[PDB]
Amino acid sequence: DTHKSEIAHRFKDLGEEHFKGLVLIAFSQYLQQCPFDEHVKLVNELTEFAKTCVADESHAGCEKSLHTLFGDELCKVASLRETYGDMADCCEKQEPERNECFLSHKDDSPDLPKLKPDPNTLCDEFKADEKKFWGKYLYEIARRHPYFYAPELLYYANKYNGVFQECCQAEDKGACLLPKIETMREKVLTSSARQRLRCASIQKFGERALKAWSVARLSQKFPKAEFVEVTKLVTDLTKVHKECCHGDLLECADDRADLAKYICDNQDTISSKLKECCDKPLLEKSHCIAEVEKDAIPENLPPLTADFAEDKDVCKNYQEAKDAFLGSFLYEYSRRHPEYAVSVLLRLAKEYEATLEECCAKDDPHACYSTVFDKLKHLVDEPQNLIKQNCDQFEKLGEYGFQNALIVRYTRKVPQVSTPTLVEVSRSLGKVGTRCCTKPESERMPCTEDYLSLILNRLCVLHEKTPVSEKVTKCCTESLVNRRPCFSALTPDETYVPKAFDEKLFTFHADICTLPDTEKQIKKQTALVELLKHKPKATEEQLKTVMENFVAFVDKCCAADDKEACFAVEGPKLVVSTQTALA
Secondary structure: OOOOOOOHHHHHHHHHHHHHHHHHHHHHHHHOOOOOOOOOOOOOHHHHHHHHHHHHHOOOOOOHHHHHHHHHHHHHHHHHHHHHHHHHHHHHHOOOOOHHHOOOOOOOOOOOOOOEEEEEEEHHHHHOHHHHHHHHHHHHHHHHOOOOOHHHHHHHHHHHHHHHHHHHOOOOHHHHHHHHHHHHHHHHHHHHHHHHHHHHHHHHHHHHHHHHHHHHHHHHHOOOOOOHHHHEEEEHHHHHHHHHHHHOOOHHHHHHHHHHHHHHHHHHHOOOOOOOHOOOOOHHHHHHHOOOOOOOOOOOOOOHHHOOOOOOHHHHHHHHHHHHHHHHHHHHHHHHHHOOOOOHHHHHHHHHHHHHHHHHOOOHHHHHHOOOOHHHHHHHHHHHHHHHHHHHHHHHHHHHHHHHHHHHHHHHHOOOOOHHHHHHHHHHHHHHHHHHOOOOHHHHHHHHHHHHHHHHHHHHHHHHHHHOOOOHHHHHHHHHHHHHHHHHHOOOOOOOOOOOOOHOOOOHHHHHHOOOOHHHHHHHHHHHHHHHOOOOOOHHHHHHHHHHHHHHHHHHHHHOOHHHHHHHHHHHHHHHHHHHHOO
């Protein structure tokens, strides 16, 4: 009963272009510092060997796993040690330990040069060779995002050649291109942050957590899908993610297709909105199905309380399959409330779990769990007043001013975190203003809950690598679903000794007037953070004073005939007045 050669099953099923694409992504994520040219060699080689195993299945090595073959090739890289250190001892291990070891060196903050894309040299390179322009893009996104969802990477990379196909024929390439890549670039970062949380769930909270996520997400989109169908799409959707998150990129891709294919062939029992989606070429259909509008709530739905609170058999039901009965609750809940954010529904079910565990203990469980829904109904509203405040502060200050607002709020909160992580997180938190505060009122909170969890997950991820605040560790490990309130309930502690003053953190040169705009703000926001690790009690009135004092200074010195002499003299002046005002 042996369908023998895994490389050959995959090469056939995906076809060559997708095989090559996915292989280049996989090498790109394992070795992020490597030049492009070296990866193209590793891909072509493995690809030859793939064809040979399609031609002859018995030929040597054609039965080795996909890791072993991927792994064999990583081990032959002349520059693994003197380029990747401790990584080249992975080569001393056997399968599957050798593969675990490679993964664990994926770098979530790789140090990579910022692509300042220029449309002329860039439109130059797509005409020269469209298929390599295509690969270079794959490799550049994937090496800076090493857990990127890989079948989507091909999707976007095609969308991308798509822009150049339409824009390099116009009379102002520039004016045509940059708005489209920029709208594109935002969707890609959002999609990578999404995937990164999917993988954190499983790696850190179990398959049970991801799976539970898909019940929420699915039930909500496909409320007229009955539970067994939902259950089924869930099984196959957790598998696709598990494999994606584990670097099994070829199995993942092929299993997403089989699912895209299963969904479209079962429209009538799943949802009525898919008919347009179920009609594109492969990449686009899958993206369509993941982007698709939600279906209508069936009309005569039996009130929630029926099965889950009055049922004189709840505890019995629950004990016989805890996870199914809870999945069932999540299904039931999610399909009736497509308004809610997932993070919220998964928080509703978790609380619901906690209630049976402890009610089912007591002699009269029914007296205990009959009342759960009010408990639950109060969960929704805890968030709401957070929202109002932050959108006011946001409208009040604008995006930049709000980022510095968060930078201060979050540095007093978790002063130990490193300065680059505090900057990046606060910037991203502040864009949640622009994302969510112009939305309809009853929609602002769901929006907010949803992205915070991508952003809080990035904080944990950046921070689990080099663990230094106990506060953050606790909020990251304690729960998946309760991070946002765990991070909002944190206070500035008086258990933090201020950082000793460091001159080099508050010295500025004529370069500051040179930087790209993002860089300029990031240089300033760093110094903002370093100022609050040093002067952690400094008031809001005082900081107001410093920030203005600081704007004037940069303005002043970015205008003079000798800027260097201008920073030299005014720099120390600034330090003095600040030290005085704050100390």
